[PDB]
Amino acid sequence: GIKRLRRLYCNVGIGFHLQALPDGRIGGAHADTRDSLLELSPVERGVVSIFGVASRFFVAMSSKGKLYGSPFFTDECTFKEILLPNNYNAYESYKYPGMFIALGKNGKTKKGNRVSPTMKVTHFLPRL
């Protein structure tokens, strides 16, 4: 079926959308940048892949909790999409339980093993 193309907004700092850059880096952008358009594709129930449409990189997380861009699909590119209050979602590494995607108030990524789902830095609101 169809796959939704959206932006994942983290309400920290001035507000940032998760984005994948053309050089393989992952970060945040306040504006609705082309690199922040993400294709969310279901892998299995409750699990999704997050693909940067423009950069052509999947968002991935290493065993050390580091978010990075993967040019090809792997087992480090899958995340459990967990519903939170007020329609926000947390994204937990499928391969490494307990690690979550997160952006800090400075608009940069945080290590997945240094944040918990109760923290705002792991809360993403699906938008446009």
CATH of the domain at 42: 2.80.10.50
Closest CA to 69 of 56, 80, 78, 79: 56
The label of the residue with tokens 């990524």 reads 109
* CA distance readout (Å), 59 to 2, 15, 23, 54, 86: 20, 19, 12, 13, 24
Number of domains in the chain: 1
Which residues, including other chains, have CB under 8 Å from residue 98's CB and lie 6 or more apart?
92, 113
The label of the residue with tokens 């129930």 reads 45
Residue ranges making up the domain that contains 55: 1-128
